[PDB]
């Protein structure tokens, strides 16, 4: 009987869809993480961070969840499904529909100033006298990459029958590309190309790897470009870094909608734009490129996407 005891266990098994108007002869395939319990890739880590914290006793009945953040919407539905209280912090700058959703899920919301971005959101460590609160810390909590190592990567391996050659993923916390790369490279033993994507507006991974001045900047690609290197980004399994600009990312997401019939978020367009560039290099012509589409476009109705 495939009946889940609560919504948190229904995470993953997202589909692979071949692109028709990007890439070269179908070499670009997308993984639609929009099709998850709270409709983003973060559902996977919202569940596992809560699960793991239960497993080692730091999360118990009567403790209240805290973190800074789609991760919020993920933790909120998990908190609701499993019966936890939850306070959150989010940059004010994020789309209204994720603001609106959190309130309906029972969250104690606390917006933070947009100019300070995620660093400002992480005004959350402030929040956690302990004993009552527990902060889950998505940017460094290893339970974030390991759910991707346990489910998302294996889903990609199985659905491609081991044929995946390249994985393209935008980087926020870095959990996705880390767990996925570790699974396919270390668990399944295949030397793929792991491609991190970041905004050209805030290319801190590129600058770091080049031994250059780290200069983050503001951008419109919600989800990625934290402005620093997160602990949950394993630089050692990253083979390549692609940068993408906001306008192109937006245009690409619109194209996914109107030309492919795929309802994808802003960061999904960035990831595909990056993948499309690699896919049109002759060196990648015989390569199957798998691209993570982290979220769905209805969570961006209030944004420059529409």
């Amino acid at each position: 009987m495939a009946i889940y005891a609560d919504n948190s266990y229904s995470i993953g098994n997202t589909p692979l869809v071949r692109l028709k108007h990007f890439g070269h002869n179908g070499n670009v395939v997308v993984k639609i993480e929009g099709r998850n319990p709270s409709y983003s890739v973060k559902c996977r880590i919202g569940a596992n961070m809560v699960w793991q914290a239960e497993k080692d006793g730091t999360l118990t009945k009567g403790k209240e969840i805290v973190d800074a953040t789609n991760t919020g919407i993920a933790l909120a539905y998990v908190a609701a499904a499993r019966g936890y209280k939850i306070t959150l912090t989010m940059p004010e700058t994020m789309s209204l529909e994720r603001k609106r959703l959190l309130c309906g899920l029972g969250v104690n919301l606390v917006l933070t100033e947009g100019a300070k971005g995620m660093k400002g959101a992480i005004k959350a460590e402030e929040i956690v006298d302990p004993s009552r609160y527990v902060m889950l810390k998505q940017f460094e909590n290893p339970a974030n990459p390991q759910i991707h190592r346990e489910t998302t990567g294996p889903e990609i391996w199985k659905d491609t029958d081991g044929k995946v050659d390249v994985v393209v993923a935008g980087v926020g916390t870095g959990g996705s590309i880390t767990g996925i790369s570790r699974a396919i490279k270390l668990d399944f033993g295949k030397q793929i190309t792991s491609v991190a994507v970041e905004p050209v507006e805030s290319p801190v991974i590129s600058q770091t790897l080049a031994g250059e001045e780290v200069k983050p900047g503001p951008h419109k690609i919600q989800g990625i470009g934290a402005g620093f290197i997160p602990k949950n980004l394993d630089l050692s399994i990253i083979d390549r870094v692609e940068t993408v600009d906001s306008d192109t990312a937006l245009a690409t997401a619109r194209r996914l909608m109107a030309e492919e019939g795929i309802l994808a978020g802003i960061s999904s367009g960035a990831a595909v734009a990056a993948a499309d560039r690699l896919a049109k290099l002759p060196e990648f012509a015989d390569k199957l490129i798998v691209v993570i589409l982290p979220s769905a476009s209805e969570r961006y109705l209030s944004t420059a996407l529409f």
């Binding site: 940059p91 700058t93 100033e113 947009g114 100019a115 300070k116 971005g117 995620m118 660093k119 400002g120 959101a121 992480i122 905004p199 507006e201 805030s202 983050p216 900047g217 503001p218 951008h219 419109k220 690609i221 470009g225 934290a226 402005g227 906001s246």
Partner: peptide, 6 residues
């Protein structure tokens, strides 16, 4: 400040 820079 769009991103934001943090």
């Amino acid at each position: 400040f769009e991103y934001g820079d943090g």
